[PDB]
Each structure stands twice: as structure tokens, then as C-alpha cells.
Amino acid sequence: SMDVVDPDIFNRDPRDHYDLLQRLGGGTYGEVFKARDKVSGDLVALKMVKMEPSTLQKEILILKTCRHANIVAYHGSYLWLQKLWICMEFCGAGSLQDIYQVTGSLSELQISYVCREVLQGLAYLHSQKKIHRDIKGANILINDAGEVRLADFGISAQIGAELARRLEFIGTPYWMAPEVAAVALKGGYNELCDIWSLGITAIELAELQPPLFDVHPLRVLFLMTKSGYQPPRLKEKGKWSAAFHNFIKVTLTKSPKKRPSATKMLSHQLVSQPGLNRGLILDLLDKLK
Template identity: 35%
Template sequence: MKVKLCSCDRKCSVNEILKCIGVGAFGKVHKARNLKTGHLVAIKIQDCTNDKCMALLQECMLLESFNHQNIPKVMDKYYWEQKLYICMELCAGGDLDNSDMGTGFLKESQIAFVAKEVLETLLYLHQKGYVHRDIKPNNILLTDAGEVRIQKENGDYDDRCDVWSLGITLLELAEGKLPLVISSSNSLYEYWEQKQRVPHLRKRDKWSPAFHRFLKDALTLDPAMRPSVELLLQHEFVRNVEHEPSPLKRCLRRSKFLGSIRKFF
């Protein structure tokens, strides 16, 4: 994969690096402004003095091979002073686990919207032979318009693990917390498998029977019996969900308003 080499002058003339908006395994993510177009972008910056730089290059190459509206697009990449810069689409709405959006406050129609968007993205990935294996609220990003974007991961797992993770994610979005937190070395899935119990919504009367049935299907303990992403897309809970306008736009307006109040005080 080709990476542009650039001088300090080129870097400074193309992007103005703004505030840091995230820190992860692949370095820091900054909001930046393209000085030629004025557009805001997200830039991943990775120190290339360690082996994580190659992993980030591989991630970038993988993202460039995808063509799906719910996967963030790579716009540019360059190397400068032992650091790799990858410019990507900015998801200005943040993630579904950020402090302003929060979890546990989404309506069922909004949760169904998230479910359908994630399922459609997973279907695309699975058909190309990839497994995400890390579906969770802070890996589900939103644009300013409330559109869903999925941060991509990969690992040696079967695609049915993504269905289980989506079910747990929807539980967290509905109730604001995971159905169980354990401190042992066992995974949450292993705990439920050992107990032969299925995670479920605590406030049964608050949610529709369709939502309960969707979660029961997605959280089927036996992976061989768990429905595929393609089958879940036909489920009554998500079948009639419309993509536009996004029902999450109102949440974004509310979170920005609350954020402005916090800044004022």
C-alpha cells in the first residue's frame, strides 16, 4: 500500500489539527480542518516507532477496500516525522457511549434504527468474509445527521459472535448498563452459557413484544441455533424501519444543547 511522504510545509498547509477526540490502541484521533476545502475530518495519528504502525496501515488498507455507507471512508494518508496520519470521515455526532449522548435514554424506535443499520453493515462484512467481533456502543458512531457508522475490527471468530454482541449492545442502549458485569477471567458469554440463562430486558412492560423476541433470537445461547444477520434483517422489529430521516437527530440536538449548558456553567 502506498503512503505519501510529506514535508512539514505540506502537512501544515493541508490540515489544521484541532482537539483530540479519542484515544485507542492505534494512537490518538484528532478533529482537523482541511485548509483547502474547509471540511472537518478525523485524523488518526500513530507513532511509527513501534509495530502498531503496520497494524494501522493494514486497518487502513482494509477500510479502503470497503464500499459501504456505514463504514467510515479513508480520505487521505501520509507520513511525517515518524508518524502516520490517516484522514477519515468525521463522525461529529460522537459514539453511542459518549458522555453527552449517553445510553439508557433511547426510545425503542431509535434502538430499532440502530439495530437495522448495524445489521446491514454486518451483512456486508460477513458477505466479504469478515467478522467485526467488537460491536458495542462506543464503536457505533454517528454523523451530524444521525447516520450510523461502524468502526471496523477483525479477529478469529465466527460471524455469529456479531449477532450476540449486537443483542448485548441493544440491551445496553435500552437500559444504560450491561446485563451483567463480572470480574473473573471468564467472558460474559461464557457466564451466560454456564448458567444456561439468556440476558433479557429487566422492565418487560416498557418494551414491545417484537423487541423482546428480537433479543431472544439474537441472544440464543447455542451459536448453531442463533439466527444469521441476514435472517434477523427480516425480523418484525427492524423490517419496517426507515433509513431517513434518522430518528437519532433529535438525540444529537438534545446532547449538543446539554453539552452547551455544561460548558456555560
């Protein structure tokens, strides 16, 4: 009650409300488990993080204040015995990475529908002055109806925490050049970084991996910052339509001043075409079986 926006954190065992099912996956953030509501029988995903004896509260708040069909729903969190369990919408088919690893390259129409859906979620997030900063196949989830939901605001919360603390150390601003003020306040970039990530994700869904995937991370950073760096392209030309080649070209615009917003990208031919609906992903899921 003392918070402006209540994060809805229960100081109790999540097993009071849920039946813990299988571990779906894990990483540096912690683990994701499947769970079932003890009264309604509805499925949920629990993201469990091991605590040390505030940035997770920021992640919960980013999620809670989203109320959009293309962003995973929030159902409350449990803080118990040094563990935080964030309860969210369960997406029965997993991530697009989980799917394409069995299925192979998605079709152009299936990629188009996913991009339209991700752009809707992004336009909504950017309208709220939020940035995702971790768009990729593993964070775009698919439910049993073939519908698309964005997940994982972990990096978004880490950046929010970093920028809020940074204000404590910057000192007086009056003599700062505008590019120094941009780093101190915003980290030196804006929400258009998500549009680039979606373009890379479209290549990922078409080629099963992002460009340079087998190059070392620090070397990829080095390659991307060289003066003669050029945005990546789809390897096969003839397989894709000129609209998919162009969608990649404009989302992967090098200069952020010319890279279009999520709202603007929703007018692109590739994502505004009439045959885009969840039925395309239902076809993909049939192939999965």
C-alpha cells in the first residue's frame, strides 16, 4: 500500500496458490517453471530468481503496468525463503526459438505475422516510455492459439536501475554537451534499438540464428563498431520476396535518426498485407508435431 504502483508481491509460499510442474528452462536470470492455479486449474509460468542474503521490483512493475494482448500477462509474485517467483501468462508452444529448433526456417508469411504482432507490442511499450532491449526469438512466445506475446523485461529493469542510480553520480549538468547529457540520462540511445532487434529476429526466424552467431560476443561488438560496418542481409536472395528484403533493410537502418518507429513500421507492406492471422502459426505448430 505504501507504493505508488503496488508490485503485488505475496510474502508466502507460491505452493499455497499453485501446483509446481516441470522446469521449462533456465539461465543467468534464474529458472522458468510451469505451474497450475489450485482453484481455477489455469496454467501459469513462474520465473524463479534466487536472492542474496529492487531491480526485480522494477521488472515486476514494468510488466504489471503493461496491459496489452502482445505482452505476457502478470498474475502476482511470491517472495519466500530467499526466492522470488514472478507469476505470468503461460505460452503453451514456448518461444519461437523452441519452435524453429524442431521446425526449421519459418515461412515468409509466418515471419510477417510475428513481426506485425511484435511491432504492436513495441508500439505500446514505447508509448509508455518503456524500452524492451532484449528482443529475440527466445523472448517472443507463442500460445496454443498461435498468438504472440513478448516476454522478459530483465534487461529493461537492469537498465532502468542503472540509469536511476547514474543520476546520483553525474553531478551538475550546465556545462555538459548534449551527447554527454544523453549518456548520463538515457544511456546514449533510444527505443529505436528495439526496431533493429526485431529486424535481426526476422533474419533469425528465416535462418535459425542471428547473423555472426558463431563469432565471439566481444568480437561481434568490435565488428559492429568499426567505421565500415554494414547492416546484415538475408543470405539467400531468391527465396524471399522483395517486401521481406525491404523490411529487413529499413528495420536494420544503421542510423537511429532514420530508423522508423514501431507505429511507422506497422504501415510497411510486409506487415500490413491481408493474409496475416494466427492460423499461419497454427500451421507451424502442426509441423512441430
